Design a protein around this ligand. Structure first.
Ligand SMILES: O=C(NCCC(F)(F)F)c1ccccc1
Ligand SMILES: O=C(NCCC(F)(F)F)c1ccccc1
Lengths: 191, 191
């Protein structure tokens, strides 16, 4: 409960400044508690980011499980769009956590490992689906499915996050979904 | 001259530990000079990284100008491979600088702007070539050329650098060139 308060406060404060510029004291008063009461719920401001990013990533993950268990009744282009869109919408709704999470991969081993565990899972799911499409005679046996899936997933990570942070250069947010779908569909079905 | 010594020393020390863990004193003795003599050539260890990354990136840039002025006499797949290979070979030969440079984008505005200036130039060159291919009737008018070029360049940045750092996940270094060429050629020529 106070736990949700510290989390919401961190997400809000990260909408306006980096983690380096937010104090434990800043998070404490935000949730309406003392510095020492803060330390009962979290070991550090860094563990607060790790928890937010845990929640964002698991939300993406569950949303993609829900898609996998309940296929959308559509063509191959839309099957892939619906999947990429889990990442667009989920992270797109949590840009501050997304951006702060990505910078913490450099400094925090737990953040790096969390990102790494989920990226390995999403790449493995992507490759299994390409393999199914190949077994069905729907896609040609070009590159190793897992090598292809790895590059395409790395493209979506870099390209979504550049867009969300308004980096230069970046695809504009309103064009990025279509851009990625074109590259997935041409690279998975092209000869 | 002592300048080249500080640069070589920094590159060597970055083959073994991050910049955070290298002192000005560490760079100074490396080049066989005093701390204060160091400060005559460079304002900081951070300006030393900025200079290395300047050199790496300009080397990539000149190598791609040389390709553009002197076309390779080959099919479209090899034209693109020869281009992606400038980035593979150049950065691939300077992984420590590459990796330390990429982490410094987060903390250093000069590093971020340098990376941003060159990425904008390589994306602009990529789009002009796709446009030429389209004007020639060699590629179909699918996505906006600059949106396509931006995503494909962002894919090569993330995917090359994950490979070079042996990240998990990543395409293995010996498979990454072929992986990227397949995605460029299918996405640029596919309908
Ligand atoms: O879009 C994807 N991956 C991007 C994951 C991200 F953004 F890098 F975290 C994806 C799409 C369909 C099925 C599986 C994965
Ligand atoms: O491979 C490329 N871009 C990647 C640039 C990098 F790696 F991201 F720095 C490229 C290929 C052909 C022509 C122009 C650019």
């Amino acid at each position: 409960d106070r736990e949700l308060a510290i989390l919401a406060t961190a997400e809000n404060l990260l909408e306006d400044r980096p983690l380096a510029d937010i104090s434990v004291d800043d998070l404490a008063k935000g949730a309406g508690i003392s510095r020492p009461t803060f330390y009962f719920y979290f070991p550090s401001k860094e563990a607060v980011l790790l928890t937010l990013l845990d929640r964002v990533v698991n939300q993406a993950d569950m949303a993609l499980q829900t898609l996998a268990e309940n296929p959308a009744d559509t063509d191959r282009e839309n099957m892939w769009r619906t999947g990429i869109n889990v990442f667009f919408e989920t992270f797109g709704s949590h840009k501050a956590v997304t951006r702060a999470g990505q910078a913490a991969r450099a400094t925090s081993v737990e953040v790096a490992e969390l990102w790494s565990t989920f990226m390995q899972k999403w790449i493995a799911y992507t490759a299994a689906v390409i393999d199914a499409e190949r077994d069905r005679g729907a896609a040609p046996r070009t590159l190793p499915a897992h090598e292809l899936a790895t590059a395409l997933n790395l493209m979506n990570e870099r390209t979504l996050f550049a867009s969300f942070a308004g980096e230069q250069p970046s695809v504009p947010e309103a064009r990025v979904l279509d851009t990625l779908v074109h590259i997935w569909v041409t690279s998975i079905y092209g000869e």
